[PDB]
Design a protein around this ligand. Structure first.
Ligand SMILES: *[C@@H]1O[C@H](CO)[C@@H](O)[C@H](O)[C@H]1NC(C)=O
Ligand SMILES: *[C@@H]1O[C@H](CO)[C@@H](O)[C@H](O)[C@H]1NC(C)=O
Ligand SMILES: *[C@@H]1O[C@H](CO)[C@@H](O)[C@H](O)[C@H]1NC(C)=O
Ligand SMILES: *[C@@H]1O[C@H](CO)[C@@H](O)[C@H](O)[C@H]1NC(C)=O
Ligand SMILES: *[C@@H]1O[C@H](CO)[C@@H](O)[C@H](O)[C@H]1NC(C)=O
Ligand SMILES: *[C@@H]1O[C@H](CO)[C@@H](O)[C@H](O)[C@H]1NC(C)=O
Ligand SMILES: *[C@@H]1O[C@H](CO)[C@@H](O)[C@H](O)[C@H]1NC(C)=O
Ligand SMILES: *[C@@H]1O[C@H](CO)[C@@H](O)[C@H](O)[C@H]1NC(C)=O
Ligand SMILES: *[C@@H]1O[C@H](CO)[C@@H](O)[C@H](O)[C@H]1NC(C)=O
Ligand SMILES: *[C@@H]1O[C@H](CO)[C@@H](O)[C@H](O)[C@H]1NC(C)=O
Ligand SMILES: *[C@@H]1O[C@H](CO)[C@@H](O)[C@H](O)[C@H]1NC(C)=O
Ligand SMILES: *[C@@H]1O[C@H](CO)[C@@H](O)[C@H](O)[C@H]1NC(C)=O
Ligand SMILES: *[C@@H]1O[C@H](CO)[C@@H](O)[C@H](O)[C@H]1NC(C)=O
Ligand SMILES: *[C@@H]1O[C@H](CO)[C@@H](O)[C@H](O)[C@H]1NC(C)=O
Ligand SMILES: *[C@@H]1O[C@H](CO)[C@@H](O)[C@H](O)[C@H]1NC(C)=O
Ligand SMILES: *[C@@H]1O[C@H](CO)[C@@H](O)[C@H](O)[C@H]1NC(C)=O
Ligand SMILES: [Ca+2]
Ligand SMILES: [Ca+2]
Ligand SMILES: [Ca+2]
Ligand SMILES: [Ca+2]
Lengths: 219, 219, 219, 219, 219, 219, 219, 219
């Protein structure tokens, strides 16, 4: 059974659209969007935003099990990505676009979630990335990694000691920085601090992007 | 293994009775009733009523997992119908019968439950039907679709704002019309408003039917 | 200390406005509106509506302990009225007005809540009324009495057996009748059945009033 | 303020009816029934049965706070009896009546509930009776005393070790004898073992009585 | 994989002892005792008692999932027996022995648990038996069947209405009868009513047996 | 008994120290600090900070009942302030001091908490202040009033719609301005936005003060 | 009403036995043992042990509200002692006896519980003692004080960091020392570390005493 | 699929590193560490410590599911070890090392967890070891076996009766000896009793070891 979009690239399915993958056994498949157009196909997607629509506040269960629709905006789910990356090696790519027409992207050579954990949930779905290659966006994930996933209803204890105020965000946080792609959908610019879709290296802490997309591919 | 009644029709088992199907793996089958005598066989049945007996009030867990008996009245369960419809395409048929001796039916070209959701339970098991084909009963499911399943204990909060009073029903609702085939079992006619087994197009909002049956078939 | 508006009528306070009463000891008083203008003063008020403003859906705790503001719309609370009527004899009066300018009223000679109960909450705050005297509104409370108070989150079991659908109302209910002064605030008229501020004897089941007020007085 | 029926006997109120007593402060009185016609008046009543009506199954909260009506059948409540007996000494009288026309009675010289406990609820509302005086009914409370109150939901754990089956009763128990005056209301005679209103000394374990009444008086 | 002791009788394992069976897939097997000595082998066992040791009070989860040890006393579990009997036809046999040396047995031609239920737990694991053949013990299970399984922590509502006192037993109960093989382990005889290991047809309501064993076999 | 510091000023107790007050009956007094040296004595104090020590994060229960020490920093409690202000009229004074050596103050003519609510807790302990009188600090409480008390665990739902991020503060809020005197204890100046002890009119949103004190007096 | 044994020493009650005191209003009194024999009377007791009998494991609620019997062993309750010491000044005395006949005692000039706390429970019922005067037992409470009360079900977090293992004791703990008079009742000597009734200054960490008693008196 | 390190030794993978094993079906593998260099390879490792790092306090869920990292310190999990040992026989080896430079080891001929239980969790994951073979460390697991697993939150009730104080440990206990290899990480020597990593036979109850490792192998 096809584990990812790589096996879908075989058996002559070199097209674009929603398919089925089998990350946790031959039963209960999952629909996912494979982008076979950019460089050579593959590029399994696990995040997508282009307009307001689906809200991204959510909680621990919703991030562990996934939400959204496959043809629109969605988040695959930490459990599924962990089960995928436990078996095979992979590689991460992130591309994003602001309001005008502007474009940029970034590439990382290695990507995994809780590499050698006996129980992935008990560790907390930590991040790992290595081998940054620029594309005009900058390195904003290498400072992280080694940090567990977090939410607004889980943690809210060590943040109040080291920093002030509550996080109210879902990403791999290292310090008091509150910039991530899982924030609220604001317009072109905002006056508040980092609470929208922010990529600090490209635009800054006062510009919320238009489209986000994170993909992985075997290497 | 057989997935539904269409595979039961093969291996020379063309008859009318309770069989076994395997929607969620080779283990733990489910007994169901296939009505192989109307048009061409197949016609997997996920709802049945002919007298009072089984009560249909229930809650979210019961409608998610299923209740009743295979030979009498029952409800297959939203989870199993979702698992069936995800893999293969289908087509919906409804046939109904008044108290005196009359019968009617309706047909829909496409039937699916939460088509492209990463998690079906988070979406709410929405309905989708298109391609109506008249048979003397009218169109009473096209106005809906795009709406989620609600019960008397899950939601009961957005209804008291637009409308008054509580719903106390189990169907895909769109507005304050509270007539559905999963209501109470009253006599031929009643003075209260739509709170029995009502099909709005055929009889109206003041007549509770005698027998109901919903069947799906591969197209 | 003044227990009710009768003691406030003494010590030369024969005016109209918000005062203080001491129903449960010399500590923790309660503000209440005394209407000393209609016939001879007194007339302690325990209900008031004149526009939408305060919602009346509420629950068991909110009806047991009271809610609202004294200068506007409010509900005193079953505990306070029980403590008042346990000590002294009283008498009930209800007056109401529709949209135009129309007026009417009704009078009852006796009023009490759980007269001889060892534990008032365990009985359920039953109603008692005797000696109806007409004023142009009719008798719509004598059919009740002997019936416990009810709500939408308490009961919802014996209603489904005897009647269909859920109550979603707060009053002393005897049968499947769903007309009371603690319903939703609709306009002059509505198409739905009794779910607004309905007094069946005066207007009917399709007219929601404008103003309601229930008072008590010693006799 | 009057504390019990003994103070009601003064101020010229020698009669038979429901009065008010103040066991827990000058506020929040409790209505009770004083039987001032048997020997010398007084005789505060904390239990009454003459027909089926009120059910006596109940739980720990109900027996702690009290249930029933003052004119009919009721249970005063362990808390109020404890508060009464703590301040003043008393004396217990029980009178009972079979179905046909017969009557009997018993007398105890001293009655108290949890005499010298810092917290009565933690002790379990133990019983203490001494100085039996025969009247034709026998001694059925001297074997007990020193034992705490138990119910069908509080304890139900030490009984399944010494004896078999569950208790489902509300009295001060000593061993596997499960006969008490707070049982079910059966007819004159029954085939099952002691599970009705049984007084072991007078009739036996196979006869459920018709009327019960427990009264206390100052000594 | 071997589903029961019948497949174990194949592949040349015609011996007596603890084996493994696969009732719910090729993973997570179950150890069970097969009695290949009486008539022709097979005879999968799902109950065993010969001395006090393991207690049988337990609850709903413990009866649904099973308890005990395979070489001693144990109860297989309603889920496992349901999964077994859903697939293949079977036949029930019960044999028992009192204190002296005495023996007896009974046979039933048909045995199943929730035959045509869409969700077995929702029905309640009902019993079915047909075709009694005597062996000196009598028919004491045909009066039952059609009745759901029950326990001391589940039900305790309809028993108090129809009968008095609490059940405190685990079997398929039809009326106020409290005799079953899942009771307390008493000696040869007892003075209390049916609360030990009682088979009413053979000995009576005052004799608790020594050994019990219930087996099933394909037919 | 003394109700506040105004009655403490009488009976010849004009001094500065911790005394006892009786807001909720003759029993269970509360120790408080009266500052009888500024203008005319009285000046009951319900808030105090001069260094870090006590933490002010807390929750709804702590702000309802009160925390801290009488001689150091503390919070009197919304319940006691409500009980005090309900009986008598009062008048609010606030005095504040920057880090270097500067001081300022403000005065309000009328101060009350939930003026005419039947139940204060259901209203939310709203604020009401009128009649500002400048002293060099500015008006920072007139924009509020009519708003209820909120915390980081009670509400946190209407804020994420109008504004972004969570509040994590304890004051009467009106809009997304999150500056109040019950924040964190930072140094003289900080780079983050208003999350310390900020008084907007005097210094701004980037300076956390050194000492705070709120006092009320009878008018 | 008599607040303590000092008022009982008035009105000519200079005897020894169980009396009543009124620490929280004129209602709900408390029985207590006053020792008017040692030096000059008074000596209100709040702890007593002379044999095994009553267990002292208990929890937070049992220590807050009190337990035991007044004529035997008991613990008054932190709430009652706090209410007593809030109003009047007092003085503490402790005396104890080992197995043989040996005796000793200690005296402290000042004793209080949460002196200036706005909410006593929120602080945690801290200890204060000053002015030690020897009597042959030594000073073992001055090292403590300023430390909150603790139990086995409350805390169990900071103990695991600073020390190892769980406390399982009820006293005012300062460091890893586990010697107190609220431990288990062992014989004359034991081999384990401090887990019995230990007073380190007199006997040591391996000797459990015979009798304990703590009293207070006004000064 | 490989079930343990013994099948990893085949297919030419004789090395030392982290591999994958399939104890609960073909899906969801678990990463583990095989130490293929001591005697003959194999030697699956289900415990590892060499410095402080990971904390071993934990609870019942963590010990049931497993925690830690494959390359560092970890605990495999009672469920997976039970699943492994149920299918095949094994043999236990323990090797330990003091702080200075010394090492030792012990061997047991048979190792299993809950051998013949219908439900392993209900039994408590009991231990069974036989056939000790000395290597210079002594026998410290033969006294146990037949005992269930206990933690600081599961049981903590039968211990306070036989012994004093709470356990706060995770091992198979028999009596009040509280020395096990899953304790706290202290230095070379400590003054407190057995609460670190203690092996009683080799060093004693006052020395916490440096490195631990438990391995099993097929026999
Ligand atoms: C957002 O995009 C989705 C993509 O299908 C579309 O369905 C939806 O209408 C869009 N919403 C708005 C407000 O543009
Ligand atoms: C972005 O591209 C679109 C082309 O569809 C154009 O209409 C728009 O003006 C561009 N934006 C800017 C800022 O030029
Ligand atoms: C309802 O139909 C079922 C069909 O299985 C039948 O068993 C039952 O007796 C019927 N009930 C009545 C009241 O006719
Ligand atoms: C309906 O058909 C049945 C046939 O079973 C017949 O007995 C009955 O009279 C018919 N009734 C009507 C109203 O047509
Ligand atoms: C409703 O009446 C109250 C009475 O004070 C008033 O404050 C409020 O503004 C009114 N609301 C509307 C919508 O008229
Ligand atoms: C009711 O009285 C008011 C007087 O303020 C008047 O304006 C209104 O027209 C009256 N309503 C009708 C229906 O005449
Ligand atoms: C039981 O006695 C009460 C006395 O108040 C009476 O009201 C009721 O009707 C009686 N019930 C029956 C069934 O006789
Ligand atoms: C009991 O006394 C009543 C008097 O009300 C009488 O009618 C009845 O016959 C008597 N019965 C017996 C058995 O004495
Ligand atoms: C009960 O039987 C089992 C069977 O193995 C045995 O282990 C146990 O010792 C027996 N107990 C008694 C009390 O005879
Ligand atoms: C039952 O059989 C055994 C044989 O081991 C014998 O010892 C015993 O006496 C028999 N019982 C009776 C009542 O004879
Ligand atoms: C804070 O002030 C209090 C005043 O009671 C004082 O006891 C404490 O030591 C101070 N803390 C610091 C860190 O100065
Ligand atoms: C503030 O006043 C203090 C007096 O205690 C003085 O020591 C300090 O130098 C002053 N600082 C400033 C900035 O005025
Ligand atoms: C312990 O002392 C109490 C004091 O009254 C006594 O009642 C009890 O019998 C004693 N227990 C033992 C075991 O000596
Ligand atoms: C303690 O005193 C008692 C007097 O009753 C005496 O019997 C006992 O021997 C004394 N203990 C010792 C150790 O002498
Ligand atoms: C403990 O050992 C681990 C081995 O992975 C190492 O990463 C860590 O730094 C060590 N910690 C210390 C304090 O030496
Ligand atoms: C232990 O061995 C190490 C080798 O790494 C050595 O450096 C150290 O001195 C030795 N210590 C002892 C006490 O033998
Ligand atoms: Ca967090
Ligand atoms: Ca209701
Ligand atoms: Ca039951
Ligand atoms: Ca603690």
């Amino acid at each position: 059974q096809p584990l990812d979009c790589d096996d879908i690239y075989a058996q002559g399915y070199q097209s674009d659209g929603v398919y089925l993958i089998y990350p946790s056994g031959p039963s209960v498949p999952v629909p996912v969007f494979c982008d076979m157009t950019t460089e050579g196909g593959k590029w399994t997607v696990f995040q997508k935003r282009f307009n307001g629509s689906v809200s991204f506040f959510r909680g621990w269960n919703d991030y562990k099990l996934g939400f959204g629709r496959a043809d629109g905006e969605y988040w695959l789910g930490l459990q599924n990505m962990h089960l995928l990356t436990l078996k095979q090696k992979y590689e991460l790519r992130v591309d994003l676009e602001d309001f005008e027409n502007n474009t940029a992207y970034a590439k990382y050579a290695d990507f995994s979630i809780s590499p050698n954990a006996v129980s992935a949930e008990e560790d907390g779905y930590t991040l790992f990335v290595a081998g940054f290659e620029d594309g005009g966006a900058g390195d904003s994930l290498s400072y992280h990694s080694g940090q567990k996933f977090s939410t607004f209803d889980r943690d809210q204890d060590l943040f109040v000691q080291n920093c002030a105020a509550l996080s109210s965000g879902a990403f791999w946080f290292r310090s008091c920085h509150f910039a991530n792609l899982n924030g609220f959908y604001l317009g072109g610019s905002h006056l508040s601090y980092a609470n929208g879709i922010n990529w600090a290296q490209w635009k800054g802490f006062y510009y919320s992007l238009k489209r986000t997309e994170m993909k992985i591919r075997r290497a």
